[PDB]
């Protein structure tokens, strides 16, 4: 199957949708061959088919099983009467209509009538125009619903008016309704969308169309639109509980550093003060885990503890001291406001009231709180019989004692909730359900905050990822996915505000990315992450959004070695890629639907080219497999939308310059993608031949491989020879001789001097092959193949620079004649052929040697190499490599065409 077939057939449920499954089994793979290569006609027909099928489910009588087939065929033909029944015959058989139903040629009159009156000698088989009624109104609904551009385009007059009078003529008593979310922040935007979906289905709404910022629904006519103040509290509880359980499990909101365990500002809001202290024994059992070099001996050394106490501790210095010291540290640092009510508790809820005086537990410098590492090491020395797991069973009970004790005394605050308030205001600016009241935004506050961003009357920095229209706070190593503390143009110049700002909205989003992508905090940028965003061609059907869920949660981590292997095999037909296992019934049904469908690369090498090789391939590939539109960028913030973005199928924001050197456009139409994939796989299959090692692709050298291919096209054969040298193989396969030549013809395609040099290197060898032919079956050496060209080049290089071209032609042809007469007679095509008189064999040999030598001295040396021996000496090696590949190609072409 194709990847698009594979994803789509999962979304169906056979008990009463089998006819749409017959289409995906047979017409769909032919559809994306003819129509697959702005917008693509295969993705238009697929969304049109699916949307009419979803409209059909509402009809109060079931459409006949014969008529469902007419809809499925008619909706494919619609992009183009005896003068049209033949254009239906040609196109149907190309599209394998036969396999959907063999019967179709009977109904071709109807199938052509639904795709464009009088019968013209072709009478309709379907009983009466009461069956053409639902068919024609279904077909004309899909082919306008898929041309909407935003959820508002059904309340805006341009296409929405006709969608209502169509639905009325279909007798459905449902009504179009929408949601839209104008502001598009990543996972938080996806969560908001999927909570509105999960809410409105309880009103019996059913989504009909999906867009990058929203949904259109068929919803009943007698339903209340959900209240603004209610979907606010629902969507906050959704996001705050889903992130809540993640912080409670410890995979987000906590970070280890040198001053001990830290907690994110938002953890302090989303968990009550009593919750965090009950979770700490489990987060230390995840975040405090270095058994190779734990903190306690390092901390105790800088305490200078001495006094014959040191050995009581040091013989038990272990990870199980750290975990307790880190817990006591974070509770002291964040939970209790004055220390003395709590140092007196821990020193008696543990048995250390005597050994350690209250004030000697607070010793610190630079926040490192050395004193608790002494406390923990006494409790761990006294109970030294424990292992790590029976210790964690202690510390879980110690935390729950601390939690209960703190709240019976009331020693912790009901901390503020600022991210709820700014999130309720984020919803009030940027979320709309159809029939909500709306206000003009006060953009003055967004300017006023910028005008003061570098002035003392701004308390926290302005957001680095947005405009600063919502309250912001300093970036944290435990919140953001990258370095918090680098130079900012937004912070005042020469000020002490060295940390950048983040909006409280983007702070939840970075934490949702830690929680739901499972990426590092403050360190994800060093994985060189490039993000591919799979935007719609305006509209997706519900089955396509389910298909894109099965992709973005299930896609295989690409390895280019076997993508190479399955394309040099299959003779470079790019259609082979359609069938490969790109993934790992639906399996991701519990995950949220991707409204902004993001997939990302991770690299461990340090260069920009090492980052881009998989994203650039995937960003061409997914539009070629699924008809989606891809933008590849380094930005964790996604691109803000407009109708100008859609004017190309792919964008690649700032590819390593190998892209531009190859002359591939950094934005591509659907007509450009198969040229581009051919050039990208051609450069990968040449780089993985030379400048690679079998386990190490060395993508840091792809800029050296491209610059050589572009400078002079014969380097394609110089690299093929290096690959033969690494593989320790003495000659290319028959496949390699046409592969590396189709690559040279591909990279030369636009250039006059390269097409001239590639035509010259063939002509050069095709000329000496008139008088010399070593048979490749005898396993000859690279030198034996190049005997006349090596003796031509050595002549040009050895003579004084004063001597004429017409002297070189004579001296070198003498050396060719002298060399040929020392080889065995079977190698000499003109002399071995006894059919003609001896002086005429001599005369034909002499003029064949002369014309070859004239091409070497006139065209190879004089014109191409500028008549300069320095410029020839640099090329001697690649001219030789190019001529060996030319000789083997001319021989492979001869041994075929001689039949």
């Amino acid at each position: 199957t194709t990847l698009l077939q594979t994803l789509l057939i999962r979304t169906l449920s056979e008990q009463k949708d089998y006819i749409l499954l017959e289409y995906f089994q047979t017409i769909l793979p032919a559809l994306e061959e003819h129509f697959g290569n702005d917008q693509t006609l295969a993705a238009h027909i697929l969304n049109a088919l699916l949307t009419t099928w979803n409209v059909m489910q509402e009809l109060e009588f079931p459409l006949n099983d014969i008529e469902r087939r007419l809809l499925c065929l008619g909706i494919t033909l619609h992009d183009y009467i005896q003068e049209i029944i033949n254009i239906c015959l040609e196109l149907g058989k190309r599209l394998n209509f036969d396999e959907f139903w063999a019967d179709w040629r009977d109904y071709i009159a109807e199938i052509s009538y639904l795709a464009q009156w009088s019968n013209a000698g072709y009478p309709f088989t379907i009983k009466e125009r009461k069956l053409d009624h639902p068919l024609r109104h279904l077909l004309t609904f899909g082919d306008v619903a898929v041309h909407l551009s935003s959820p508002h385009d059904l309340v805006s007059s341009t296409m929405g008016d006709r969608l209502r009078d169509l639905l009325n003529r279909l007798g459905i008593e449902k009504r179009f309704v929408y949601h839209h979310l104008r502001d598009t922040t990543g996972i938080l935007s996806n969560a908001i969308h999927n909570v509105i979906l999960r809410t409105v289905q309880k009103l019996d709404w059913k989504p009909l169309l999906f867009f990058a910022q929203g949904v259109i629904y068929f919803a009943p006519q007698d339903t209340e639109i959900p209240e603004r103040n209610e979907i606010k509290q629902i969507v906050w509880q959704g996001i705050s509980q889903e992130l809540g359980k993640k912080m409670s499990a410890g995979d987000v909101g906590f970070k280890r550093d040198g001053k001990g365990l830290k907690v994110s500002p938002q953890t302090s809001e989303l968990l009550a003060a009593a919750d965090i202290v009950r979770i700490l024994p489990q987060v230390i059992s995840v975040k405090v885990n270095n058994a190779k070099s734990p903190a306690t001996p390092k901390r105790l050394e800088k305490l200078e503890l001495g006094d014959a106490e040191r050995e009581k501790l040091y013989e038990v210095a272990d990870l199980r001291c750290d975990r307790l010291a880190e817990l006591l540290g974070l509770v002291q640092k964040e939970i209790f406001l004055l220390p003395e009510p709590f140092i007196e508790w821990v020193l008696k809820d543990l048995e250390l009231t005597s050994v350690i005086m209250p004030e000697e537990t607070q010793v610190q410098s630079g926040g490192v709180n050395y004193g608790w590492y002494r406390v923990a090491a006494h409790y761990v020395a006294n109970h030294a019989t424990w292992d790590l797991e029976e210790f964690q069973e202690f510390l879980q009970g110690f935390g729950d004692r601390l939690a209960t004790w703190a709240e019976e005394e009331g020693y912790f605050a009901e901390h503020q909730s600022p991210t709820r308030q700014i999130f309720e205001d984020y919803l009030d600016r940027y979320l709309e359900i159809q029939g909500w009241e709306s206000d003009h935004q006060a953009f003055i506050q967004e300017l006023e905050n910028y005008v003061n961003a570098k002035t003392k009357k701004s308390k926290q920095p302005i957001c680095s990822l947005s405009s600063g229209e919502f309250p912001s706070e300093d970036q944290m190593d435990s919140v953001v996915l990258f370095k918090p503390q680098q130079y900012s143009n937004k912070n005042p110049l020469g000020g002490g505000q060295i940390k950048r700002g983040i909006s409280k909205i983007w702070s939840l989003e970075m934490l949702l990315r830690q929680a739901f992508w499972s990426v590092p905090s403050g360190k994800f940028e060093d994985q060189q992450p490039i993000f591919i965003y799979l935007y719609p061609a305006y509209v997706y059907a519900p089955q396509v959004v389910e298909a894109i869920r099965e992709l973005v949660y299930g896609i295989a981590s690409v390895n280019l070695w076997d993508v190479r292997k399955h394309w040099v095999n299959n003779k470079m037909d790019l259609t082979s890629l359609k069938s490969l296992p790109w993934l790992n019934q639906l399996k991701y049904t519990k995950e949220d639907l991707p409204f902004l469908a993001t997939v990302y690369t991770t690299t461990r090498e340090k260069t920009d080219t090492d980052a881009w090789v998989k994203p650039a391939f995937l960003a061409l590939l997914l539009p070629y497999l699924l008809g989606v539109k891809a933008i590849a960028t380094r930005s964790m913030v996604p691109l803000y939308r407009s109708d100008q973005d859609f004017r190309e199928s792919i964008h690649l924001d700032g590819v390593a310059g190998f892209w531009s050197l190859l002359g591939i456009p950094t934005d591509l139409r659907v007509e450009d993608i198969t040229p581009a994939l051919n050039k990208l796989l051609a450069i990968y299959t040449l780089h993985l031949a030379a400048r690679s090692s079998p386990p190490k692709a060395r993508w840091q050298d792809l800029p050296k491989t491209v610059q050589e291919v572009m400078t002079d096209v014969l380097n394609v054969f110089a690299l093929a020879e290096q690959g033969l040298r690494r593989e320790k193989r003495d000659r290319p396969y028959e496949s390699e001789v046409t592969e590396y030549w189709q690559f040279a013809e591909l990279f030369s395609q636009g250039n006059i001097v390269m097409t001239e040099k590639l035509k010259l290197t063939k002509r050069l060898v095709e000329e000496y092959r008139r008088f010399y032919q070593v048979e490749l079956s005898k396993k000859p050496s690279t030198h034996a193949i190049l005997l006349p060209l090596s003796k031509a080049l050595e002549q040009i290089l050895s003579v004084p620079d004063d001597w004429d071209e017409e002297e070189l032609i004579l001296q070198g042809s003498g050396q060719l004649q002298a060399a040929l007469d020392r080889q065995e007679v079977y190698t000499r095509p003109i002399i071995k052929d006894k059919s003609v008189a001896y002086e005429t064999r001599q005369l034909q040999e002499l003029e064949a040697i002369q014309i070859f030598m004239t091409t070497c001295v006139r065209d190879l040396f004089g014109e191409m190499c500028k008549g300069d021996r320095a410029i020839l000496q640099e090329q001697r090696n690649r001219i030789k490599s190019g001529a060996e590949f030319a000789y083997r190609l001319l021989a492979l072409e001869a041994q075929q065409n001689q039949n």
Binding site: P492, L493, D608, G663, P703, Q707
Partner: protein
């Protein structure tokens, strides 16, 4: 020459920009293997080959504004330190440091090329400039050279194990030309001699300047105007088209064809122009500025006045 041009310039540095531009038209010729890199490759961009309506695109080397302005700028600061107008010592009253809080607010570099401390002052660069482009294609204009770094005992092996210290690096070739316009707003006469000084006196650019990267700045004309004249890209695309792509020409034919292409362009651009110093008037102007930069008394005088003018601007209108 210089005695006639003294009328054109401002008599002292103005507060507001007045729209007097003196434009230096140059060909920067590569002399030994410069490396204009960022991100580990020679910087390149796709461009149209020339102005005459081509379908034909061309990858050309780009020398960014930073890569040419900073080597000019820093060659001025070391001259001012050698004249003793500024100092490197943290205990001196005329300290200037290139980027931090310790930047001066008075010296010629700070007023002509600008500074930004924060609230304690900033000044806009009066030397305007553009990113320069190779006249020919990247495929014609570069070569890649291997480097290695063995043990001092002459061997890639030490103690029986190999060093990983080999790689390629990418270099521009010893005849590649980068057509350039540098432009100076609202300058005093001595401000023009300081900046024109930097253009003629600095000689190395790009990475590895300790070992490579000499360029010859051939000045081709000076043009006094009410406004911005044309871009480096537009001059380069005009110059390629005047040659029809026969890029293999000697330095003096390439400079004289740039002098007539500059005048062909200046006639079309809508700004009024007071003076057009080209040819034998430029070669006498260049001799008359070379004569300042070779004389200890004359140069200490002019640059002393520049200092005073910029110290006076600083105290009257500048950052005090």
């Amino acid at each position: 020459m210089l005695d006639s041009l003294k009328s054109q310039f401002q008599p002292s540095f103005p507060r507001l920009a007045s729209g007097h531009y003196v434009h230096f038209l140059m060909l920067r010729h590569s002399q030994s293997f410069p490396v204009f890199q960022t991100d580990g490759v020679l910087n390149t961009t796709r461009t149209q080959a020339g102005l005459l309506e081509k379908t034909d695109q061309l990858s050309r080397l780009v020398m960014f504004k930073r890569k040419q302005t900073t080597p000019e700028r820093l060659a001025g600061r070391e001259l001012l330190r050698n004249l003793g107008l500024t100092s490197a010592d943290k205990s001196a009253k005329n300290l200037c440091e290139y980027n931090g809080e310790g930047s001066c607010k008075q010296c010629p570099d700070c007023i002509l090329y600008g500074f930004a401390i924060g609230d304690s002052g900033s000044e806009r660069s009066k030397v305007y400039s553009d990113s320069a482009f190779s006249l020919g294609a990247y495929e014609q204009s570069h070569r890649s050279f291997t480097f290695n770094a063995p043990f001092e005992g002459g061997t890639m092996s030490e103690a029986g194990v190999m060093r990983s210290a080999i790689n390629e690096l990418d270099h521009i070739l010893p005849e590649v030309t980068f057509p350039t316009v540098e432009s100076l707003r609202d300058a005093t006469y001595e401000g023009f001699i300081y900046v024109l000084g930097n253009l003629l006196r600095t000689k190395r650019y790009g990475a590895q300047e300790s070992r490579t990267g000499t360029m010859k700045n051939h000045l081709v004309g000076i043009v006094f105007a009410d406004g911005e004249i044309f871009s480096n890209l537009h001059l380069t695309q005009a110059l390629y088209d005047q040659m029809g792509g026969e890029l293999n020409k000697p330095i003096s034919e390439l400079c004289e064809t740039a002098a007539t292409v500059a005048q062909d362009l200046l006639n079309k651009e809508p700004v009024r122009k007071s003076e057009l110093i080209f040819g034998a008037h430029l070669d006498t102007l260049l001799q008359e500025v070379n004569d300042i930069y070779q004389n200890d008394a004359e140069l200490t005088k002019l640059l002393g006045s520049l200092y005073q003018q910029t110290q006076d601007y600083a105290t009257e209108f500048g950052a005090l």
